[PDB]
From Swiss-Prot, chain C:
Protein's cellular compartments: Endoplasmic reticulum membrane
GO BP terms: cholesterol biosynthetic process; farnesyl diphosphate metabolic process; steroid biosynthetic process
Cofactor annotation: Mg(2+)
EC category: transferase
Keywords recorded for this protein, A-Z: Cholesterol biosynthesis, Cholesterol metabolism, Endoplasmic reticulum, Lipid biosynthesis, Lipid metabolism, Magnesium, Membrane, Metal-binding, Multifunctional enzyme, NAD, NADP, Steroid biosynthesis, Steroid metabolism, Sterol biosynthesis, Sterol metabolism, Transferase, Transmembrane, Transmembrane helix
Keyword Metal-binding: yes
Organism of provenance: Homo sapiens (Human)
Bilayer topology annotation: Multi-pass membrane protein
Annotated residues for binding of NADP(+): 20, 45, 186, 283, 285
GO cellular component: endoplasmic reticulum; endoplasmic reticulum membrane; membrane
Function noted in UniProt: Catalyzes the condensation of 2 farnesyl pyrophosphate (FPP) moieties to form squalene. Proceeds in two distinct steps. In the first half-reaction, two molecules of FPP react to form the stable presqualene diphosphate intermediate (PSQPP), with concomitant release of a proton and a molecule of inorganic diphosphate. In the second half-reaction, PSQPP undergoes heterolysis, isomerization, and reduction with NADPH or NADH to form squalene. It is the first committed enzyme of the sterol biosynthesis pathway.
Name of this chain's protein: Squalene synthase
Source taxonomy: Eukaryota, Metazoa, Chordata, Craniata, Vertebrata
Annotated Mg(2+) binding sites: 48, 51-52
Spans through the membrane: 252-272
Residues represented out of the complete protein: 33 to 369 of 417
Length: 323, 333, 334
């Protein structure tokens, strides 16, 4: 019945229409800890995003963000972004953060500290290589999967092996992040944001923006297909990560977004609309396997032989189905 | 037995909605709940039948529980579609008397209490919201309480499930209120009134004025006020479901509750309650890959329907603050 | 590891080419069952493809069907003369049998035995149609019952299911009979177009002198009647199906066993009293939509709901109408 906790849940619903219901369904202490983690991550993301904040002002904000968690009066009033309310009323959020058990604070602060560095590192450059794509995805998403896993285990609802496996928790975040990046080409174009790796896109066109023109549609779809093929390499780790989970509320929280990203990839595959117009549930592991496999076959049947990634796309799906 | 076979046939004819989940119940609950539903159906059918004078109906409702004990009692004068359960009541009551004594206590107690309550309402419409709660207790709350006592008597669920009659009552009240709200137009065509008079008279002269195209704004305002009232039962519904441990009971209890919030979500601020038909279902993103058969999924499905309502609350609606407030409470608990 | 078996990868590619329906659920099986069932499925498909091929004469075919279980141990054996859609499993049979011989020997024994027995039975039916309902049961045992038996022995041998699962061959047999009878009922028309007859003669001859006649619009009423009789026959396996599923304890096996059965019951319900079975299409048709087939009480509810769908549709006019009601009533009984 605390006023500030009511407010935190109001903010969670405002900012995260995708995840709020599954966060609210989490058992015991995870529910509040994950709610607060999400809000603080959203605040950090909103600062990163805001192009009205100069790089020299933004670098210290990102570096020092983890420290603001411990400054009861800290807020930021100069943002012009959609989710600015979490920054403007950051004291309500940080107060509830400071009400969490210390074990959860430590994980959250650590992740904010590391994410802040990584976000600041990438402010003045675009992602070049695929290796750099992975690094940027680690900083903004892979670290979240690591942080979530450490929260699951700290709470004891999951076994300590969950939080220990940072490699696969990282792939969980890489998978969701690459999916959103793939899907959001047009949106990000409109916002002068570039997230597709340059070493990939420049084999097709001179400027990433070129994929938005009618005459480059064929090349665009080839590059789309290459990036999807890249994203699919995370699925074996996703399946191993999900298979270790023992708590139903955790399982639901982790599995549903992975399956939803898999559906998104399947719908995006070989789909020119990326550049223009656009009996099972997933709550037990064998069902989640089956659903992932059906989606892989939707991709597999659509692979064009002329596509320059075709062999690789068949190869990764063949790996997913077989092993 | 041949009589038990006939009871399952009747259950399937008269209970489109619960017949399959009842037949899936484990062990002794299956027969106990099958019989409970049939005698409730019989009682309901007597209550609904407008060719039975008040003079005759009052003793039938008060005395119905006792007919369970009387092997030859039947009723041959019903003009309702479900009348076969009354005409062949001896077959149903025989199986009632075949249940463990502990189940008979529960079923008869409920029938006794429900009959009294229904007889009390033969004479009057629902006035206050407190009166609304009382009516729904009689026709639905008591069913939840009865069912819960059956689960606990069967020992498939902990004693608490049967003991906490307030939570059980809330299960019935939530379903009943949703049904009453959903069914404005169908109960208008039928000539008896269920929306509470103390609420609707703050908007119009007679309840029938809501069907008239010029009163839509007030109609939807009242609709929204009543929905807001029903949302107050959700904490108890989550509490109740979260205490269940048996899969068959969980399925039986959880599915209608999810269907009920789904319905309220479709009705909220919706003109089609009054000048059309409300379509439920259809693609709420994150819950599309959840079935309602584990508690955390059910929590998520409920929370997501709450947000579907919350997103649609317009500032100018007189209840808008109260609707926000209860949803905020459900979210934070 | 990308240095592990390329031949197993090819097997899974074939499993997906040949099973548009089941591949995902087989791939979702725990542990040793995944590959055992994949390979079982592939060798069964190869056997079925030989049996199906009308360009192979009866005299040439019988020895292939009889010896197929031994070809499992002939590393270079393949069959190059098929023109059937799934002929790749025959042409690249060495890749499949290699992976078969890599299964633990306890699973090999089970699969070989079923292939042996299946071959004998298939060969028996090459020169006769199904006459009586007893013969219908026997044919269905040969091509499907035995599959349910073999799978159940794989489940028990893996230790993922109780030993009782593999021992109770009658319940396992009924699982196969239920699917196979449903498929035969649904495929009246496609089977007419390829000149092979599966509806039991002792039944259909009570309605027309020629099974082809059910495709004549003048006999549509007699067709639907005979149809209802066959569905009624198949419904009799449902108590055993429920008993079978109620013994399962491993989620992955449960999903694999229940989904096909639920799909079959849906099909029987969409077919019942439906003349579209003789004219065209047949596309599958509230509580059911809120639960999926992944726990036993939900499966019961789903089944019971399809039973009411049939029940309320029974025409008093129908000659099996009494019998349809009795079997559904029985299904409701336990």
């Amino acid at each position: 019945l605390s006023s500030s906790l009511k407010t935190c849940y109001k903010y969670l619903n405002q900012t995260s229409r995708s995840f709020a219901a599954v966060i609210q369904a989490l058992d015991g202490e995870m529910r509040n800890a994950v709610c607060i983690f999400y809000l603080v991550l959203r605040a950090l993301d909103t600062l990163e995003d805001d192009m009205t904040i100069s790089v020299e002002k933004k670098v210290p904000l990102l570096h020092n963000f983890h420290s603001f968690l411990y400054q009861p009066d800290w807020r930021f009033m100069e943002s012009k972004e959609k989710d600015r309310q979490v920054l403007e009323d950051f004291p309500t959020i940080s107060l509830e953060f400071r009400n969490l058990a210390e074990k959860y604070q430590t994980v959250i602060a650590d992740i904010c500290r590391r994410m802040g560095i990584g976000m600041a590192e990438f402010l003045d450059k675009h992602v070049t290589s695929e290796q750099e794509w992975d690094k940027y995805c680690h900083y903004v998403a892979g670290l979240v999967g690591i942080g979530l896993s450490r929260l699951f285990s700290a709470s004891e609802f999951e076994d300590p092996l969950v939080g220990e496996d940072t490699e696969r928790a990282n792939s969980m975040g890489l998978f969701l992040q690459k999916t959103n990046i793939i899907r959001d080409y047009l949106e990000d174009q409109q916002g002068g944001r570039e997230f597709w790796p340059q070493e990939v896109w420049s084999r097709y066109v001179k400027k990433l923006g070129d994929f938005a023109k009618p005459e480059n549609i064929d090349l665009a779809v080839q590059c789309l297909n290459e990036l999807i093929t890249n994203a699919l390499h995370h699925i074996p780790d996703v399946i191993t990560y999900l298979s270790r989970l023992r708590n139903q509320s955790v399982f639901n929280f982790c599995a549903i977004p992975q399956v939803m990203a898999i559906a998104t990839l399947a719908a995006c595959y070989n789909n020119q609309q990326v550049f223009k117009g656009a009996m099972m549930d997933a709550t037990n592991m064998p069902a989640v396997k089956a659903i992932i496999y059906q989606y892989m076959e939707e991709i597999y049947h659509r692979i064009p032989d002329s596509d320059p990634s075709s062999s690789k796309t068949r190869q990764i799906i063949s790996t997913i189905r077989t092993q």
